[PDB]
Design a protein around this ligand. Structure first.
Ligand code: NA
Ligand SMILES: [Zn+2]
Length: 118
């Protein structure tokens, strides 16, 4: 329940939004707007507008990477934490005005963002 069972695929990129990754396997099961890694790349660049607000970017960048390019290992993908999600709501509240959060990026989604597994 802190992880989701899935089939891992080899990462086509070694970088998520500037950050080098310490893993080479991923899954697209968490990003409900992407079916391929090439689509996840496109959607990730779409979120890169939040760079102009450092206090938003500091928390939203690790979260988006945990959703779009998460670590897959031994048939399981890791789930992003509820604490990390809630930290984004306030400094990134501009999203609510401009487009709103997708269901897979809402904190009320307890199966996507469970608490405990930090
Ligand atoms: Na998907
Ligand atoms: Zn491998």
């Amino acid at each position: 329940f802190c992880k989701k069972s899935t089939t891992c695929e080899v990462l086509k990129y070694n970088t998520c939004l500037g950050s080098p990754l310490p893993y080479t396997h991923t899954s697209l099961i968490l990003a409900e707007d992407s079916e391929t890694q090439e689509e996840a790349f496109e959607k990730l660049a779409m979120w890169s507008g939040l760079r102009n607000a450092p206090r938003c970017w500091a928390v939203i960048q690790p979260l988006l990477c945990a959703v779009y390019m998460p670590k897959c290992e031994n048939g399981k993908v890791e789930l992003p934490s509820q604490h990390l999600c809630q930290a984004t709501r306030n400094p990134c509240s501009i999203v609510e005005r401009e487009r709103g959060w997708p269901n897979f990026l809402k904190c009320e989604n307890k199966e996507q963002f469970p608490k405990g597994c930090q």
